[PDB]
């Protein structure tokens, strides 16, 4: 009935950090489960450390790309700790086919739909990038905008008002646009290049059929959340972390009424949800991909991990 699906993956265990005297603390009872200190968590799915960068990909976004070809919206979250890897599933390798993660692979099932119709569709692309920083919407690609609003129009759809719109024609263009907008993105430091603050890269894919004469339009939303911090140097840092937690727990609300199936679900309480509205919930899907460290070292944080994955399973 939600429609949002929870994938759990854990990363393999490195040389580095089994030098340091470190257990693998996960146990996976199937395709379903991953037990850690004997208490099970159930998701949509979980990855072992084996599985490809391809099929999660197949897993997680693929029939989310082709239904946003379809002309539907969807949304793909990226929740993860620091070396949790989530960047090596959301980003990957550049041009590694193996390799690649989730976003190249997108950008690149787009165009191959593309190139392969040629003829008979016409598309525009339009991308843009913006992070929500202490709970302002700041523009990635335009760095003087560092405070816009979210607004509804006369059918209900969201928009973030005056946010860069960029043209794409080449999936080297997608990625360069996500580099720009990667180098302006809040990040700190006792961890290491900390995000401070949830990006969101929208995908704009509008058709025009040749033979019809009519149009599509598809939203397609990659989240990349920024980790809840257990702080209590008191100061800019900390409202940092207290408007991380807020957002989060704002989406966590949203999430979980989705997933009860609340006939009211509470998408005003923060800017995110209100950006995400057309594209969480009802007919939109959604894939939450939460990232874990197999590590007994990190093994209170992937259980803050799963715990909120499961805000979101049903």
């Known amino acids: 009935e939600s429609n949002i699906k929870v994938m759990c993956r854990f990363r393999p265990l490195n040389e580095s950090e089994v030098n340091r005297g470190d257990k693998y603390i996960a146990k996976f009872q199937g395709e379903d489960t991953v037990v ?14 084996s599985t ?11 029939k989310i790309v ?9 949304t793909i979250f ?3 700790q620091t070396s949790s890897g989530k960047t ?5 390798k550049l041009h590694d086919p193996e390799g690649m993660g989730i976003i190249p692979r997108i950008v690149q099932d787009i165009f191959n739909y593309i190139y392969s119709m040629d003829e008979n569709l016409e ?62 993105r809040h990040v700190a430091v006792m961890n290491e290049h900390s995000s401070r603050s949830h990006s969101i890269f929208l995908i704009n894919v509008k058709q025009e059929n040749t033979q019809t004469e009519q149009k599509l339009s598809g939203k397609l939303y990659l989240v990349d959340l920024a980790g809840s911090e257990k702080v ?5 840092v900390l409202d940092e972390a207290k408007n991380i937690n ?69």
Do not use: W
Not at 36 to 49: G, L, M
């Open 36 to 49: 850690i200190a004997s208490k099970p968590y159930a998701f949509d799915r979980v990855f072992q450390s």
């Open 246 to 314: 807020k957002s989060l727990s704002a989406l966590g609300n949203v999430i979980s009424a989705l997933a009860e199936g609340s006939t009211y679900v509470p998408y005003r309480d923060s800017k995110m949800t209100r950006i995400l509205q057309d594209s969480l919930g009802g007919n939109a899907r959604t894939t939450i991909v939460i990232c874990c460290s197999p590590s007994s070292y990190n093994e209170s944080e992937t259980k803050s991990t799963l715990l909120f994955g499961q805000r979101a399973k049903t």
């Open 123 to 184: 598309f525009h692309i339009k991308v843009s990038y913006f992070e929500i920083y202490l709970d302002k919407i700041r523009d990635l690609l335009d760095v003087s905008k560092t405070n816009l609003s979210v607004h509804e129009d006369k059918n209900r759809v969201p928009y973030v008002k005056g946010a860069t719109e960029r043209f794409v024609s080449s999936p080297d263009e997608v990625m360069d646009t996500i580099d720009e907008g990667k180098s302006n």
């Open 88 to 92: 090596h599933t959301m980003e990957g």
């Open 78 to 80: 990226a929740y993860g």
């Open 52 to 62: 490809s960068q391809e099929q999660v990909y197949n897993d997680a976004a693929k």
């Open 232 to 236: 209590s140097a008191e100061g800019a």
């Open 66 to 74: 082709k239904d946003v070809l379809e002309g539907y919206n969807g």
